[PDB]
Amino acid sequence: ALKEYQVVGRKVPTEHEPVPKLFRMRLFAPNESVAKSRYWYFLKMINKVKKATGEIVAINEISEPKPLKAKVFGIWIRYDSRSGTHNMYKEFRDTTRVGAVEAMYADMAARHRARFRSIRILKVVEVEKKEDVRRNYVKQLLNPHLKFPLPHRRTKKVFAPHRPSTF
Amino acid sequence: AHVQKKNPLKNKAVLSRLNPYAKAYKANVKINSEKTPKAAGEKFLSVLHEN
Amino acid sequence: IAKRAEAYEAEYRAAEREQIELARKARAEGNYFVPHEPKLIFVVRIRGIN
């Protein structure tokens, strides 16, 4: 599973710097020991505050306020390739930001075989307007007159007596 | 002496031999009631639901 | 021994009660709160002698 964590932190204050700045991140992590490890990863590449200098101040979970409402998420990904160069924008349709990034990882694990550390997610925004959705298939599950038969049907205990209906 | 290693978690006699407090624990004290108040600041909820 | 135990048992709560309290203040205030750090650690081996 996944659990989105709000993380903020700073460095140790010195006499030269009495008040360090505070930096907020909204990232995803299956537990909290990897959040406060990924947090020092992003902040080291951007703010150059090393792990031997900074400290962690607050970790909290962000449960989705409306998990019962369908939504569509536009997903900004910086992907670290074998050449280490990919900015990616991808849309997913589901209910929860926790659930989207799981599907984001899964698709990204198939077509582009991305690992854990090979991905640094950049920004996640609940895209709302229908004219901004830039994908054909996501658009088609959003027309009022949608319909389809069931796919992947299959309706122990081997040796069935009669033929399955499969209808 | 001490032929068997008795377990003071699963034996309820050696536990009282080692710990003379098992006659008063009250592990579950009702320190709250219906009147629990919400303590969620506005500026914390603003920095929570930011982005 | 129980007189020492009663002191200890109520103290474990009285330090667990305050980190319930001292976070209920800051989170309702907008303040932040680093905790009393781990000072004990417990190390369990994972690999053999080979």
């Binding site: 008040v19 360090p20 505070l22 101040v57 | - | 680093v34 750090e37």
Partner: peptide, 23 residues
């Protein structure tokens, strides 16, 4: 004798609001 590690403390944010970054 060792220098002890750090106990707890508040840190107020009235003059230092946590900014949101992106990787």
């Amino acid at each position: 004798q060792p220098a002890p590690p750090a106990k707890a403390h508040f840190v107020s944010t009235e003059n230092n609001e946590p900014v949101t970054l992106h990787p």
